[PDB]
Amino acid sequence: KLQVVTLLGSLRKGSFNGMVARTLPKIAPASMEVNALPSIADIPLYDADVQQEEGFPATVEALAEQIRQADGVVIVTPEYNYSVPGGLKNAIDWLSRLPDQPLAGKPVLIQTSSMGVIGGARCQYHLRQILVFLDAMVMNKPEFMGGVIQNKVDPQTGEVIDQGTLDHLTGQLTAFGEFIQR
Amino acid sequence: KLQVVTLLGSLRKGSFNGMVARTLPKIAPASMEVNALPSIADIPLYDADVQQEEGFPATVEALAEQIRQADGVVIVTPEYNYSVPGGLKNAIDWLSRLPDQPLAGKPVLIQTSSMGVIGGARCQYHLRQILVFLDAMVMNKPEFMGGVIQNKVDPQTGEVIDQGTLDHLTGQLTAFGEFIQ
Amino acid sequence: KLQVVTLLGSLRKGSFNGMVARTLPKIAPASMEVNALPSIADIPLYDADVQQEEGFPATVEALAEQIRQADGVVIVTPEYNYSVPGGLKNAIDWLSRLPDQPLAGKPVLIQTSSMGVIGGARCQYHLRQILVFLDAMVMNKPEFMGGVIQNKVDPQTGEVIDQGTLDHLTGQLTAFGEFIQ
Amino acid sequence: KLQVVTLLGSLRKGSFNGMVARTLPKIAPASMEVNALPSIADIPLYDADVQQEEGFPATVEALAEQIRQADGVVIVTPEYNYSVPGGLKNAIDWLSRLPDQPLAGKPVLIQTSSMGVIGGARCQYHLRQILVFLDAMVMNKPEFMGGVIQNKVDPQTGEVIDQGTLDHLTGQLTAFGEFIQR
Ligand SMILES: Cc1cc2nc3c(=O)[nH]c(=O)nc-3n(C[C@H](O)[C@H](O)[C@H](O)COP(=O)(O)O)c2cc1C
Ligand SMILES: Cc1cc2nc3c(=O)[nH]c(=O)nc-3n(C[C@H](O)[C@H](O)[C@H](O)COP(=O)(O)O)c2cc1C
Ligand SMILES: Cc1cc2nc3c(=O)[nH]c(=O)nc-3n(C[C@H](O)[C@H](O)[C@H](O)COP(=O)(O)O)c2cc1C
Ligand SMILES: Cc1cc2nc3c(=O)[nH]c(=O)nc-3n(C[C@H](O)[C@H](O)[C@H](O)COP(=O)(O)O)c2cc1C
Ligand SMILES: [Ca+2]
Ligand SMILES: [Ca+2]
């Protein structure tokens, strides 16, 4: 069984991308198991001085060890001002500074959702440029951009229910599972 | 006289970009007064729940008001992992949610420095894409990419000394001053 | 009254973006006259040897002069392979080499359409990066990405009909008109 | 012996990138053979109407068949206005429309050179975004950006002679050769 984890790019309780991430474990192919990674909320802003005098934040090393243990990582994130959320980017800046950089050679799947029609596509291309330097193995197609995400979820359960969205989500995961087999 | 402020993208005290930023005051045109904005170090990670429950952070409000009063903003920052540093971007995310969005229509000048020959060039274009949604007035030329800034600064004073760099910057500021109108 | 011209990025006769372009004349503000520039179809591939030996192509010179006379340029184009179409970009490469570079300081408005929901959004930001080196004055908002334009046009007239799209465009032009100053 | 070919992004006789491309065959690892692809100069501007009424240009199909035959492709190109040269992009637009798109799943190496200090880096990131849609297998590091390329070549021979540039060029090719073994 492949072990895939999710890195969440939004910090709000009712996050839509948060709902997409929690739905993935329930629709993953039988040969895949998905779990959520710890939240990035308590990670402090990156400062070279702290890295030297304090060492690495426990939260950063905990997140890093779980990524190394996993066979694949799915980054589920919204788009902020046509790009990557500062919080998520900051968690990536810390990670990129670690011994045995956790994402190098690591299979990565990208997922974004927005209330807008474009569904976070802009965020995705900047993210790939970032992951290139970190040497992650990013899967090309299929891509997933959840537009008008609010009309495809269930507020109570906090999950995706729109049939169309569920099939594409399941399709991509399957492709990612086959991708990981490398 | 024009009032210009600097937004710093690095937090370490030995910051080379910080050196660039603190050098701008004495090489700017005689019609410009360059001062620094507060550090983005205390600005907490963006969370809509916080915006709703607590309102906007006081540090964010302070940063914003200084931006509103300025005639222009010079963003001085390094490039982290082929893009914009997490901290700087997070501060921008916060500012972008403000009712009277501070950077809307605000003239902006970009400058980056790095220990490598590319001088933070990649970071600049991602930052330009981001600035479109904030609706800022970003100047085109001349651009400034400080390649290997470590060889052209003076540690004792923490300012730039390489005459070539100094004239480049001065030319850019002079150009930014004309841009304001 | 302002003179605005359109640079078309697609060459096929059934071009949806072409439909957008030819619709702009009757939805523009009363202070703007929108006309089309010549097609980029005859512009040959850029080659410095040709620039040196033959000089600039007459078609390139013609395109340039019309750009110089206009108060603004609206670039209407599709998105090919997640970026700017080869032909359009090649025409820009030619213009960029001209002594009195036509687009320098020229206000530019970008609009794209596609048969998909993204509406050529990716192409727009690459094009914005390119326009920095040409030193153009590119407007920020509102932006226009015509998603699935095929469902909102009228083949018999070859113009846009979807009222929502029409008002969006009109609003953009009105905004571009104010931008010129 | 792996068969690698070069796609040239500049059309001028004295092209510096042209010199870099011609030097590659002479410094490739013993397990690799490099050849130049036909020139893109005579390829007409892409027009959907021509594709339908005329079919594909012979030059486009000749270039496409040679790419399919090769084990790897090195794109050597300059940077025009912070991006990909229109001519090269146009040759890619035609290619992307072919049956059995020639670059899908094809190993690709990127090389750029400029008279400027940045050496065509801007062109490279836009190109990768393009190759992602075409589903090419693009190698991450090492990257090659030849800055101030004019002071590293020999006008007469039309080749690179700067020792430093030659070593990196040889290093990348070796990495690409090992990369191709996939
Ligand atoms: C700082 C900030 C910037 C935003 N900018 C964008 C943007 O550039 N593109 C976009 O599609 N949506 C943007 N939005 C709207 C988000 O898509 C929307 O708030 C979304 O539902 C947030 O993701 P979440 O629900 O998982 O918290 C922005 C939201 C925030 C908080
Ligand atoms: C998290 C992190 C990521 C880095 N990644 C890059 C990069 O992608 N490109 C680059 O040119 N330099 C990179 N560097 C090197 C910086 O350019 C160099 O540390 C610089 O001197 C930092 O800016 P400062 O001196 O103002 O603190 C990185 C540094 C850090 C801390
Ligand atoms: C070479 C080529 C590449 C294409 N690639 C893309 C793409 O990357 N993104 C997209 O949204 N549409 C793409 N399409 C579909 C176009 O959006 C669609 O054909 C469009 O209607 C063309 O613009 P036009 O109608 O003005 O000729 C491509 C079309 C062609 C001819
Ligand atoms: C249309 C055009 C646009 C140019 N724009 C850029 C640019 O954006 N970045 C850059 O580094 N060099 C630029 N240059 C300078 C080239 O790097 C230089 O002419 C180079 O030596 C061309 O590649 P080649 O020698 O193989 O023909 C431009 C050249 C041309 C012909
Ligand atoms: Ca929260
Ligand atoms: Ca030639």
XYZ file of N, CA and C in Angstrom, chain B:
543
model
N 8.516 67.820 -1.900
C 9.464 66.668 -2.011
C 8.739 65.326 -1.848
N 9.143 64.328 -2.634
C 8.521 63.003 -2.588
C 8.931 62.136 -1.398
N 7.962 61.397 -0.857
C 8.198 60.498 0.269
C 8.186 59.053 -0.222
N 9.327 58.389 -0.104
C 9.452 57.018 -0.569
C 9.882 56.082 0.551
N 9.200 54.945 0.651
C 9.505 53.986 1.699
C 9.968 52.655 1.153
N 10.664 51.894 1.989
C 11.182 50.598 1.576
C 10.606 49.418 2.353
N 10.170 48.401 1.607
C 9.613 47.175 2.177
C 10.707 46.115 2.029
N 11.211 45.622 3.156
C 12.294 44.648 3.161
C 11.845 43.186 3.202
N 12.388 42.382 2.285
C 12.022 40.977 2.203
C 12.852 39.966 2.979
N 13.947 40.399 3.601
C 14.778 39.491 4.399
C 14.756 39.912 5.865
N 14.829 38.933 6.771
C 14.792 39.211 8.208
C 16.122 39.125 8.981
N 17.113 38.396 8.469
C 18.386 38.283 9.190
C 19.061 39.650 9.306
N 19.775 39.884 10.405
C 20.422 41.180 10.600
C 21.549 41.484 9.608
N 22.218 40.448 9.110
C 23.284 40.663 8.146
C 22.796 40.764 6.704
N 21.486 40.932 6.523
C 20.876 41.024 5.193
C 21.549 41.975 4.199
N 21.941 41.430 3.051
C 22.563 42.238 2.011
C 21.510 43.140 1.383
N 20.301 42.612 1.205
C 19.222 43.417 0.638
C 18.905 44.554 1.598
N 19.044 44.283 2.892
C 18.807 45.314 3.888
C 19.846 46.410 3.694
N 21.066 46.004 3.344
C 22.150 46.957 3.103
C 21.800 47.848 1.920
N 21.232 47.239 0.883
C 20.817 47.985 -0.295
C 19.772 49.001 0.162
N 18.754 48.508 0.856
C 17.682 49.362 1.346
C 18.180 50.555 2.154
N 19.090 50.328 3.098
C 19.570 51.437 3.919
C 20.555 52.361 3.208
N 20.951 52.000 1.994
C 21.864 52.829 1.223
C 21.079 53.830 0.376
N 19.860 53.456 -0.005
C 19.011 54.301 -0.845
C 18.811 55.749 -0.374
N 18.744 55.981 0.946
C 18.554 57.362 1.412
C 19.593 58.393 0.950
N 20.866 58.014 0.877
C 21.842 59.004 0.450
C 22.269 59.012 -1.010
N 21.545 58.296 -1.861
C 21.866 58.278 -3.283
C 20.627 58.631 -4.099
N 19.536 58.931 -3.406
C 18.281 59.287 -4.059
C 18.319 60.730 -4.562
N 17.461 61.066 -5.542
C 17.421 62.428 -6.090
C 17.169 63.425 -4.960
N 17.462 64.701 -5.199
C 17.276 65.728 -4.173
C 15.802 66.046 -3.908
N 14.916 65.417 -4.668
C 13.489 65.640 -4.498
C 12.817 64.432 -3.839
N 13.626 63.534 -3.282
C 13.105 62.325 -2.665
C 13.708 62.038 -1.290
N 12.854 61.664 -0.343
C 13.294 61.327 1.007
C 12.923 59.866 1.218
N 13.928 59.003 1.266
C 13.684 57.585 1.456
C 13.798 57.172 2.918
N 12.746 56.535 3.416
C 12.707 56.044 4.786
C 12.221 54.599 4.745
N 12.518 53.842 5.791
C 12.112 52.445 5.851
C 10.768 52.241 6.545
N 10.084 51.171 6.148
C 8.804 50.804 6.729
C 9.150 49.879 7.884
N 8.148 49.484 8.687
C 8.434 48.581 9.810
C 8.774 47.191 9.270
N 9.455 46.392 10.078
C 9.830 45.037 9.684
C 8.580 44.166 9.616
N 8.586 43.180 8.716
C 7.448 42.274 8.550
C 7.563 41.060 9.471
N 8.603 41.050 10.299
C 8.854 39.944 11.215
C 7.715 39.611 12.181
N 7.048 40.617 12.734
C 5.971 40.320 13.672
C 4.623 39.991 13.032
N 4.478 40.245 11.736
C 3.220 39.952 11.055
C 2.954 38.449 11.046
N 1.861 38.026 11.697
C 1.458 36.619 11.794
C 0.940 36.037 10.475
N 0.979 34.716 10.349
C 0.513 34.064 9.134
C -0.946 34.419 8.836
N -1.273 34.616 7.565
C -2.640 34.962 7.223
C -3.628 33.826 7.496
N -4.757 34.184 8.106
C -5.813 33.235 8.438
C -7.125 34.021 8.454
N -8.029 33.693 7.542
C -9.310 34.389 7.472
C -10.043 34.366 8.829
N -9.891 33.285 9.591
C -10.542 33.203 10.893
C -10.060 34.359 11.783
N -8.762 34.648 11.741
C -8.210 35.741 12.538
C -8.763 37.087 12.051
N -8.826 37.269 10.733
C -9.348 38.508 10.165
C -10.769 38.749 10.648
N -11.559 37.682 10.686
C -12.947 37.770 11.108
C -13.133 37.953 12.604
N -12.499 37.089 13.383
C -12.608 37.123 14.833
C -11.875 38.267 15.545
N -10.630 38.535 15.159
C -9.844 39.581 15.822
C -9.735 40.893 15.065
N -10.014 40.856 13.768
C -9.879 42.050 12.959
C -8.454 42.022 12.430
N -8.029 43.066 11.731
C -6.671 43.096 11.205
C -5.648 43.399 12.289
N -4.494 42.715 12.242
C -3.416 42.911 13.217
C -2.979 44.379 13.213
N -2.595 44.889 14.379
C -2.155 46.279 14.493
C -0.901 46.535 13.637
N 0.006 45.564 13.608
C 1.226 45.687 12.816
C 0.886 45.845 11.333
N -0.122 45.109 10.872
C -0.560 45.177 9.480
C -1.157 46.547 9.177
N -1.946 47.065 10.116
C -2.573 48.373 9.959
C -1.505 49.462 9.903
N -0.499 49.351 10.765
C 0.581 50.329 10.797
C 1.326 50.314 9.466
N 1.717 49.125 9.021
C 2.417 49.004 7.749
C 1.597 49.675 6.637
N 0.303 49.363 6.595
C -0.606 49.912 5.588
C -0.692 51.438 5.559
N -0.868 52.048 6.724
C -0.992 53.500 6.792
C 0.264 54.200 6.279
N 1.428 53.642 6.586
C 2.669 54.230 6.107
C 2.751 54.093 4.592
N 2.184 53.014 4.061
C 2.172 52.788 2.615
C 1.277 53.842 1.956
N 0.129 54.118 2.580
C -0.836 55.095 2.065
C -0.312 56.518 2.000
N 0.510 56.884 2.977
C 1.080 58.224 3.055
C 2.229 58.439 2.073
N 2.938 57.363 1.743
C 4.070 57.446 0.828
C 3.638 57.724 -0.606
N 4.521 58.364 -1.368
C 4.246 58.658 -2.771
C 4.662 57.450 -3.596
N 5.483 56.586 -2.995
C 5.955 55.400 -3.687
C 6.611 54.375 -2.775
N 6.601 53.119 -3.212
C 7.184 52.048 -2.429
C 8.245 51.263 -3.189
N 9.391 51.089 -2.553
C 10.456 50.321 -3.160
C 10.498 49.002 -2.413
N 10.247 47.915 -3.132
C 10.289 46.594 -2.528
C 11.693 46.057 -2.755
N 12.416 45.829 -1.665
C 13.785 45.327 -1.720
C 13.754 43.937 -1.098
N 14.060 42.920 -1.892
C 13.983 41.564 -1.380
C 14.860 40.543 -2.077
N 15.169 39.447 -1.376
C 15.986 38.399 -1.976
C 15.017 37.489 -2.726
N 15.555 36.418 -3.288
C 14.779 35.433 -4.015
C 15.015 34.122 -3.255
N 13.926 33.493 -2.814
C 13.984 32.219 -2.104
C 13.343 31.159 -2.985
N 14.085 30.093 -3.245
C 13.576 28.996 -4.044
C 12.872 29.425 -5.331
N 13.586 30.186 -6.160
C 13.078 30.664 -7.447
C 11.791 31.479 -7.389
N 11.525 32.130 -6.266
C 10.305 32.916 -6.171
C 10.386 33.946 -5.060
N 9.227 34.452 -4.652
C 9.125 35.452 -3.596
C 9.201 34.792 -2.218
N 9.967 35.386 -1.277
C 10.097 34.821 0.075
C 8.741 34.680 0.759
N 8.580 33.616 1.534
C 7.325 33.394 2.226
C 6.834 34.539 3.100
N 7.723 35.097 3.924
C 7.353 36.191 4.812
C 6.855 37.453 4.124
N 7.567 37.875 3.083
C 7.182 39.060 2.333
C 5.794 38.836 1.725
N 5.635 37.712 1.032
C 4.371 37.371 0.394
C 3.198 37.321 1.380
N 3.438 36.773 2.570
C 2.410 36.692 3.604
C 1.998 38.095 4.044
N 2.954 39.023 4.096
C 2.640 40.396 4.489
C 1.787 41.029 3.395
N 2.079 40.681 2.149
C 1.318 41.193 1.014
C -0.091 40.606 1.036
N -0.200 39.333 1.406
C -1.504 38.686 1.476
C -2.377 39.465 2.470
N -1.806 39.817 3.625
C -2.546 40.570 4.639
C -2.988 41.935 4.107
N -2.055 42.690 3.533
C -2.383 44.005 2.991
C -3.479 43.937 1.927
N -3.435 42.905 1.087
C -4.420 42.758 0.014
C -5.872 42.611 0.485
N -6.080 42.200 1.736
C -7.437 42.018 2.261
C -8.048 43.280 2.877
N -7.253 44.334 3.016
C -7.729 45.581 3.609
C -8.766 46.301 2.758
N -9.842 46.799 3.394
C -10.931 47.518 2.719
C -10.425 48.595 1.762
N -9.537 49.453 2.249
C -8.968 50.500 1.409
C -7.571 50.027 0.977
N -7.550 48.903 0.268
C -6.329 48.263 -0.215
C -5.212 49.261 -0.543
N -4.233 49.384 0.369
C -3.042 50.247 0.372
C -2.226 50.342 -0.917
N -2.001 49.209 -1.575
C -1.204 49.198 -2.790
C -1.970 49.485 -4.083
N -3.293 49.591 -3.994
C -4.085 49.881 -5.189
C -3.665 51.249 -5.717
N -3.187 51.282 -6.959
C -2.761 52.533 -7.562
C -1.456 53.096 -7.029
N -0.809 52.369 -6.125
C 0.452 52.816 -5.535
C 1.672 52.494 -6.419
N 2.451 53.524 -6.811
C 3.631 53.268 -7.648
C 4.665 52.419 -6.911
N 5.132 51.364 -7.572
C 6.086 50.447 -6.963
C 7.357 50.209 -7.774
N 8.470 50.180 -7.051
C 9.783 49.952 -7.626
C 10.327 48.652 -7.031
N 10.813 47.759 -7.887
C 11.351 46.485 -7.413
C 12.871 46.375 -7.529
N 13.507 45.882 -6.473
C 14.939 45.644 -6.523
C 15.302 44.410 -5.702
N 16.156 43.574 -6.279
C 16.577 42.342 -5.626
C 18.083 42.147 -5.717
N 18.621 41.417 -4.746
C 20.043 41.117 -4.697
C 20.214 39.666 -4.304
N 21.314 39.077 -4.757
C 21.611 37.687 -4.460
C 23.117 37.442 -4.460
N 23.515 36.309 -3.893
C 24.918 35.943 -3.811
C 25.358 35.287 -5.118
N 24.404 35.117 -6.034
C 24.692 34.510 -7.321
C 24.581 35.523 -8.448
N 25.040 35.130 -9.631
C 25.029 35.999 -10.794
C 23.645 36.432 -11.288
N 22.612 35.633 -11.040
C 21.267 35.992 -11.497
C 20.661 37.166 -10.704
N 21.176 37.414 -9.504
C 20.702 38.532 -8.701
C 19.236 38.612 -8.302
N 18.569 37.468 -8.191
C 17.171 37.449 -7.793
C 16.200 37.826 -8.893
N 16.604 37.607 -10.138
C 15.772 37.937 -11.285
C 14.445 37.170 -11.314
N 14.481 35.862 -11.069
C 13.249 35.071 -11.095
C 12.193 35.653 -10.155
N 12.590 35.932 -8.917
C 11.677 36.497 -7.925
C 10.930 37.725 -8.453
N 11.626 38.562 -9.213
C 11.022 39.782 -9.732
C 9.775 39.619 -10.597
N 9.789 38.652 -11.508
C 8.644 38.459 -12.387
C 7.456 37.807 -11.691
N 7.717 36.955 -10.709
C 6.615 36.349 -9.978
C 5.987 37.490 -9.192
N 6.836 38.341 -8.624
C 6.355 39.469 -7.842
C 5.546 40.424 -8.712
N 5.936 40.578 -9.977
C 5.197 41.447 -10.900
C 3.808 40.864 -11.178
N 3.720 39.537 -11.276
C 2.434 38.893 -11.522
C 1.518 39.120 -10.316
N 2.085 39.005 -9.121
C 1.332 39.211 -7.894
C 0.821 40.653 -7.811
N 1.681 41.606 -8.164
C 1.319 43.016 -8.088
C 0.182 43.448 -9.012
N -0.117 42.631 -10.015
C -1.217 42.945 -10.918
C -2.536 42.882 -10.136
N -2.710 41.834 -9.337
C -3.941 41.687 -8.574
C -4.070 42.732 -7.464
N -2.949 43.270 -6.993
C -3.009 44.312 -5.979
C -3.261 45.647 -6.671
N -3.194 45.624 -7.999
C -3.432 46.804 -8.826
C -2.423 47.926 -8.578
N -1.157 47.550 -8.488
C -0.105 48.522 -8.262
C 0.411 49.043 -9.600
N 1.060 50.202 -9.562
C 1.648 50.815 -10.749
C 3.129 50.474 -10.671
N 3.534 49.391 -11.318
C 4.925 48.979 -11.274
C 5.765 49.519 -12.438
N 6.892 50.149 -12.109
C 7.782 50.717 -13.122
C 8.508 49.620 -13.900
N 8.783 49.878 -15.171
C 9.472 48.887 -15.976
C 10.986 49.003 -15.883
N 11.543 50.029 -16.514
C 12.991 50.197 -16.517
C 13.462 51.499 -15.892
N 14.714 51.523 -15.406
C 15.632 50.378 -15.443
C 15.389 49.407 -14.294
N 15.701 48.130 -14.503
C 15.527 47.153 -13.444
C 16.848 46.976 -12.704
N 16.771 46.402 -11.507
C 17.969 46.195 -10.717
C 18.071 44.810 -10.107
N 19.073 44.061 -10.552
C 19.333 42.729 -10.030
C 20.766 42.757 -9.525
N 20.934 42.843 -8.207
C 22.267 42.887 -7.630
C 22.951 41.532 -7.573
N 23.706 41.206 -8.620
C 24.413 39.935 -8.667
C 25.604 39.930 -7.727
N 25.766 38.832 -6.997
C 26.832 38.692 -6.007
C 27.077 39.978 -5.199
N 26.037 40.447 -4.505
C 26.148 41.661 -3.691
C 27.222 41.613 -2.601
N 27.587 40.417 -2.142
C 28.599 40.283 -1.093
C 29.948 40.916 -1.455
N 30.301 40.896 -2.737
C 31.570 41.472 -3.171
C 31.506 42.981 -3.355
N 30.322 43.569 -3.258
C 30.225 45.007 -3.466
C 29.655 45.826 -2.317
N 29.749 45.296 -1.109
C 29.253 46.007 0.058
C 30.369 46.219 1.083
N 30.096 47.053 2.081
C 31.050 47.321 3.151
C 30.397 46.935 4.476
N 30.826 45.806 5.062
C 30.319 45.267 6.330
C 30.326 46.231 7.516
N 31.394 47.005 7.668
C 31.458 47.941 8.784
C 30.287 48.927 8.757
N 29.960 49.467 7.586
C 28.847 50.416 7.494
C 27.517 49.754 7.116
N 27.578 48.565 6.525
C 26.356 47.888 6.121
C 25.666 48.589 4.961
N 26.456 49.194 4.077
C 25.920 49.890 2.904
C 26.670 49.432 1.659
N 26.117 49.739 0.493
C 26.755 49.377 -0.770
C 27.872 50.378 -1.064
N 28.965 49.914 -1.668
C 30.078 50.804 -2.000
C 30.508 50.746 -3.475
N 30.277 49.610 -4.131
C 30.621 49.443 -5.544
C 30.016 50.579 -6.366
N 30.876 51.487 -6.812
C 30.466 52.642 -7.592
C 29.503 52.317 -8.741
N 29.724 51.195 -9.420
C 28.855 50.822 -10.523
C 27.436 50.560 -10.050
N 27.329 49.875 -8.917
C 26.040 49.552 -8.340
C 25.368 50.840 -7.885
N 26.128 51.655 -7.162
C 25.630 52.926 -6.659
C 25.005 53.811 -7.736
N 25.659 53.913 -8.893
C 25.139 54.751 -9.975
C 23.897 54.140 -10.600
N 23.870 52.812 -10.644
C 22.745 52.073 -11.195
C 21.539 52.410 -10.323
N 21.670 52.175 -9.021
C 20.592 52.471 -8.078
C 20.128 53.926 -8.208
N 21.067 54.868 -8.147
C 20.728 56.287 -8.254
C 19.946 56.560 -9.535
N 20.390 55.957 -10.628
C 19.678 56.139 -11.872
C 18.267 55.583 -11.749
N 18.122 54.425 -11.100
C 16.797 53.820 -10.952
C 15.852 54.699 -10.142
N 16.340 55.216 -9.020
C 15.545 56.087 -8.164
C 15.141 57.339 -8.922
N 16.110 57.962 -9.591
C 15.831 59.159 -10.369
C 14.680 58.834 -11.311
N 14.751 57.656 -11.924
C 13.718 57.210 -12.850
C 12.385 56.967 -12.140
N 12.442 56.443 -10.916
C 11.235 56.156 -10.138
C 10.559 57.466 -9.721
N 11.379 58.478 -9.446
C 10.855 59.779 -9.071
C 10.012 60.357 -10.195
N 10.514 60.273 -11.428
C 9.779 60.792 -12.585
C 8.510 59.968 -12.793
N 8.594 58.677 -12.477
C 7.475 57.759 -12.625
C 6.243 58.132 -11.802
N 6.461 58.630 -10.587
C 5.367 59.009 -9.690
C 4.252 59.849 -10.341
N 4.575 60.535 -11.433
C 3.570 61.323 -12.142
C 3.388 60.736 -13.549
